[PDB]
Ligand binder design. Sequence first.
Ligand SMILES: NC(=O)CN(CC(=O)O)CC(=O)O
Length: 207
Amino acid sequence: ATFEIVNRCSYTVWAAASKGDAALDAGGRQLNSGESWTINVEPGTNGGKIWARTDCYFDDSGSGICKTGDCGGLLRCKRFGRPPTTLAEFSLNQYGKDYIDISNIKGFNVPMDFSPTTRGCRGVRCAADIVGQCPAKLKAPGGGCNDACTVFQTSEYCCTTGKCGPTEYSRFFKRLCPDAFSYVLDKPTTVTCPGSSNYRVTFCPTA
Ligand SMILES: NC(=O)CN(CC(=O)O)CC(=O)O
C-alpha cells in the first residue's frame, strides 16, 4: 500500500514511519516545506504509525536528536517516537479490511490529515490549535502538547490497571479533535476501509 506523506507546514518535518520494532520503508526522511514522500507499507502490516518530527539535528550517518518525536536518535526510525506526537495509525488487511485512526494518546505536535485515496471510506483530521490552547502543565518546551500519561505517569492517565476513564486532560484533546483518540480507552474513532486501500498523510492541511 502506498502512503503519500505531504508536508504543507512552513517548517521542515522529519517524517517517520515504524511498526515499533522495525522501520516501515526507509523509516524516516527530511521533508522541507512543500515536499512529499511516498512510502510503501507491506500488505498485512499491523500496528503501523506515521508521525512528524520537528526541529531535528542529524549527523551524516543519521544520528542525532529531534525536538519532538525522536526515535532513539535516528533519522531512519526503527521504533516509535518520543511524545508529543500526533499519530497516524493503521493496520492493513486484517480479515479483509484496513483500520485507520489519528491518536493524541501520545500528545500532539503537528496538525494532521489522514485520508484514504478511495471513496470507500472517510478520512480523519486533527488540525485544531492544540499547542496554543495547551494547558500549562501539558506544555512541551520543545514544541507541542504532551498527553497526561507522559507528564504524570499514573494509571489514571496511562490506563495501565483497571478501567481508566476520561480526565480533564483527555477532554482537552477530545474537544479540540473529536475524531482522534484522546486516551487509551477512548471510544474508538477508527475508520474501517476496504482492504488494500492507499492513503495520504498531510501535515498542516488546508482544504
Ligand atoms: N496551516 C498550518 O498548519 C500552519 N502551521 C504553522 C506553520 O506551518 O507555520 C500551524 C501548525 O504547525 O500548528
